[PDB]
Amino acid sequence: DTAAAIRAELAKMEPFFPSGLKIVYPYDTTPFVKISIHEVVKTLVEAIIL
Amino acid sequence: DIAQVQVQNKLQLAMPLLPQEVQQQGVSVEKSSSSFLMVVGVINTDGTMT
Amino acid sequence: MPNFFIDRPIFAWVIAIIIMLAGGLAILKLPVAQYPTIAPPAVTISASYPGADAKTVQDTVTQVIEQNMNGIDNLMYMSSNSDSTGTVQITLTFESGTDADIAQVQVQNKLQLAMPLLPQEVQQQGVSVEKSSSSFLMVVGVINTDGTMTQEDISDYVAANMKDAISRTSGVGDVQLFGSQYAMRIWMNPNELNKFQLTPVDVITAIKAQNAQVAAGQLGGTPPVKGQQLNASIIAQTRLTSTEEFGKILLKVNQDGSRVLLRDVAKIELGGENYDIIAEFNGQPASGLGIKLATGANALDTAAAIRAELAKMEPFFPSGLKIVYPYDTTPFVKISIHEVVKTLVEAIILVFLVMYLFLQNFRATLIPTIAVPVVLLGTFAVLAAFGFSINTLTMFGMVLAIGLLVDDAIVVVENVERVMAEEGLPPKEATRKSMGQIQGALVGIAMVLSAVFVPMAFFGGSTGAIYRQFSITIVSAMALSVLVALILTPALCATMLKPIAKGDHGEGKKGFFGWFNRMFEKSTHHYTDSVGGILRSTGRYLVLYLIIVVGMAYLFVRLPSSFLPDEDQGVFMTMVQLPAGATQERTQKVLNEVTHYYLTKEKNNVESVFAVNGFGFAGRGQNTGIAFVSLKDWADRPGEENKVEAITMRATRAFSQIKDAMVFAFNLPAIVELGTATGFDFELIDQAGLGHEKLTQARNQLLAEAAKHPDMLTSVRPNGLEDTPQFKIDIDQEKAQALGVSINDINTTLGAAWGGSYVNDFIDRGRVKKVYVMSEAKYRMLPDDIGDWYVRAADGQMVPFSAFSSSRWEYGSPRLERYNGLPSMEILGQAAPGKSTGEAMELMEQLASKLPTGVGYDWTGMSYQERLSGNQAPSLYAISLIVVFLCLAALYESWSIPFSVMLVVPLGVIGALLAATFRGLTNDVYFQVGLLTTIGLSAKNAILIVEFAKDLMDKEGKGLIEATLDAVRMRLRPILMTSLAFILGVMPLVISTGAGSGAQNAVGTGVMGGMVTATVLAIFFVPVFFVVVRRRFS
Amino acid sequence: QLLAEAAKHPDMLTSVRPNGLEDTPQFKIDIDQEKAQALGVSINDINTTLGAAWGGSYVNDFIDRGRVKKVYVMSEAKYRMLPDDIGDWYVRAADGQMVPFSAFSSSRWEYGSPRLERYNGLPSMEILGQAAPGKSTGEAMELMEQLASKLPTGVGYDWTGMSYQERLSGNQAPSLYAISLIVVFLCLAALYESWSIPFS
Amino acid sequence: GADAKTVQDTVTQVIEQNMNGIDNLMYMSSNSDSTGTVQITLTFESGTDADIAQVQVQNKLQLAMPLLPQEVQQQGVSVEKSSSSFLMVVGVINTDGTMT
Amino acid sequence: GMAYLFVRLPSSFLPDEDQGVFMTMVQLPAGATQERTQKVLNEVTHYYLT
Amino acid sequence: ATRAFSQIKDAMVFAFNLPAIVELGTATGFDFELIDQAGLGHEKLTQARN
């Protein structure tokens, strides 16, 4: 939730950046969390099918 | 919340005794993790900013 | 369970007694208020920088404090104002449900770490963090009728004598003094200072040296000498106590030996810490206390206790001192609560009367008269359990749920009586049979009504807080009503009802009740005949149902929306705004004109006026004023012309003739904790460091664009102040150095003389009070007066300001705003008639999207909450519809029969809409909750009809048409008596025109219309729906 | 007056004492600032001298075995005991003269409370006492409030600490009994489906 | 260095004026000594959440904090949950007499 | 008899126990010094230890 | 990466992954504090640590 709020705030800020300024995310473990939980849910669905 | 409140209640007794230079820089009391939730970097792809 | 308590009447009575005792305890111990906490929790940081302009305050205080408001949880947004009066106010608004105490302590703690970074004068004046609020429980004014006391005298008396005991009174949460205690005032004479070669710096140094507390030590202290026997504390210089001591302060000694004292160069007196606000009551000087209710406290009890304390205080008052109550809405709260209580009592009495009319049995009429009060008491107990108070919303929720309560009682008792009169069974067996007919339907109805009403308790924001009161009240009342109908009512029916013969229906009775019985029998026969005729030709009426649904949608999409009706609470407000640069005296002239108009032209209506010169709302200053007008009792103000709306319209028309002053009189909102309407709050944000002038240009561009849309936006205005002329002094420090004059001396002289300086504290009659040095008014009025001030140089010669300074006129902001830490401009507007607030906000966003680069925008206030909570209520009411369908399917053990019940929803709604359209009411909260209760009652009736028809079809061999006809015949009477009782009970609310009539009419009109249409249409549409559904799916 | 009245009841009250301190003599010092200025001695110097000598002054911190501790400057005891001991204390003037305190100061004796107590915001005095042997705290409380009722107007009383709790318990006992009896009656009536069984 | 009367007028009364309006407060008792010490103990109803009570009295005390003397502010005004009874006393002595 | 006995029965809060410790308060007249209090305390200690 | 950076003589360079939960860290690691309990000083504490 905090990461989502931070990203929303950065999205609010972006329209007023100087020309050329760009936001990057060199360290973010949230994608791993999302993909891992999605993989477990996929496992549950596959288990139901089997 | 209560931990931070009690810590600052104890710290405000020491605040007057601190050097004026330390007070001017601002003493901070936080309740956060020791690891970065994320790192948001900012660059200038156009190379017009140092 | 109904069968369990038919054989155990004493156990049912014990349960009822327990419920009654809990309800009585809750009633005795429950808090009472006008409204609950609706607005989101907010914290205000208030600081003052005496003598500082808006820009100085913003740059030295506001930005520093705002840059340190980090690491605070649940913060929704932050706004701030910095004024030319020297004051900065920062409002931090937090999410709903945030703990106010924890939010306040976090904010104050983050401020504590920013205090060292603030100017010393601001630190000395103190920065206060408080719970944001805009309303007082009461205002207690104090006036002098002799003219021997000024405003400062009364304020000091109130602070020293009245404030403490009132603060200690039970239920008081906060007390605000309308003024301040005395302050030692040193009014300086520049000519006398020049005569003795002195400046404000010398005066301040002398006052600080000669009015101080000095630690000395101890006689025979530790570690002591071996033989010491005596020990005594050493007392030394202490703070002064009187104006006489201050006047004797020595400033210098001359060569000729003469002594210069403070009395020689300044007038010494007792005055106010500030002079920006002048309070008058009917033209007389006034002070007072604003008193706020404590959390969980009774409003009425607290007000009565405060009045008792003031009564105990009066005997010791000085001659001419009088207590008054300029702002008292407590009478309105009392009358509103009493009106709701009377409505409940009349509803019970009318239920009794209708029961006697139809059943003509005193014992039968007694049963609901016990069942309904028991449910009401249990509802009070449940409200106390969940930490709710007795406020307007909860009592009107009880009023709306009284229909469902009486419906439950009537259903049970009438079914028992009908079984007794049809089968001739004795009361116990008849009650067993009747309960067996309706118990499952009662449980299913409980589930359906739960599904209908619970979702109101999950709306977001302040509107969610408003709806939660009705949700909890109605849900608890309905659940308790069903429980009582399954426990107590069957026991009472089996224990109290007397037997009825097999065929005795009152046909042979004489008098009115024989004619009525015969007429009702014939009417029921005709109704059943017409229902059969209708069932022969269902499709013709399906077309009529489609017409009804289309008309319902048409009426719905054309009904204006609102939040809460405006009420005549016995008070209202008048705002006076003078042109930029206007002084206190001109504002006082306008305020005197307003007071004279109210006390002469409206002497029959207006009882008193409390005029405050110095602040309005959305700003403060010498050119603003507010008059709080109190009206006489509603009993003394009969007719439409003597109510707040007409009075305020007449006052505005009369005040439109006043020149050089914008004067407007208006009524309070329903909930004054928020200023709300069908409007929007817009923030124009400087996002790229453009500055105040570019932001002003962007605001003007947006305002012009909005003005080019008269049909979509109305009254799109700035909620702020325009740039005003300012006097700029340039002190050439190089010249001051060349003349041997210190810049610190120059700044101190100028600020202390023209702005005033808080020096230190003294002790007056055992209380600490401030000491202010300021110039005499005579020498700080005009720019030329600057030529009367001198500063001593190192060489000792006294230099005038003209030697090292230049002056000019420029323009500057008297009030600077920031939003979320950036410079901001607030725009208030509203959608034009026939336009939703959402589309007005969309148009505002489209208009703002074309603003200059670096300018952003935001939504705040109620607009923020509307944007955040969007399409939520329809979503969880679709969930409610799904749950209702599932509950009905479980009840009927059918996937299709449920529809015949749900198809009843429009039949009631249409009527409500009609009643709202012809009466000219809006789609406000009361209308929506009444619509929900009408839907619930209609669903109850349809469910019972369908259950009876299905039971006849299944448990007996009866066919579809015969079963439906018998079901409607058996259900006609209870439906009719319930509808009659509820409509008669809500008659006064529709008819009411007195205090609180807005809410009463809003509640009553929709309920009346919906009940009438539902009763009329359902009794011949539910059979049609049931027959069609059963014919299609069988 | 109340203490004397309580002492008149040795068989009901014991060790009836005030929980506080009596008024003490104080040594008021007046520093003639004009006279000090005439002699060229700064008032700040006088105040610092008197305070540091007779009460002690905390200057700053030092490190003892790695721990931060305080530094105090104070007069030696023998020059700090009786009022006359300022005869040895001098303050330097702007021109280097050592002015004695007698040249710019005077003194007198006063009386003052060394400890002021307030209850619920109003001035108050705390009294402690015991019940005499063979008596209970309830009897002692009754006697104490009876004695307090006979005091000058404008003087009231209150119970605090354990006495407050004892008064609370005594006040709420009868309602507790009544509610317990009612609850038992209703429980029996529900369980046995009778009013006669609960009543008997 | 402040007498009991002056510390009462400048500290105790200033603080206790703002100590009104706190939830579940049973009573308040203050003492002001001749060494300049002010002790204000507020006792709340049984079952009151002590942390919430402390937070509330702190929120009320912040309002009085700027009105106190600068010396009192520099010494620091402490707000804390308090007890009136010693759990235990741990004394320390020297068995040789070499330490004072 | 029950009503009569209830009224005449004295009330209290909690019985006093012998907890193995007790206190002695010493207060000297106004102005008494540390050493006079020490002499009185020494007398009290001598009484308790003898 | 660690093998490659072992050739940098100017600095100690270590590349590493994080544990599943940072705070638990190693499943067999211990954290130990050596306290100077008698005002020995930094030098004596360093000697004891060595």
Ligand SMILES: O[C@@H](CNC1[C@H]2CNC[C@H]12)COc1cc(Cl)cc(Cl)c1
């Ligand atoms: O006098 C005004 C407050 N005085 C303020 C200045 C002076 N110093 C600080 C204090 C009165 O405001 C009101 C009066 C009423 Cl009857 C009703 C409301 Cl809602 C507000």
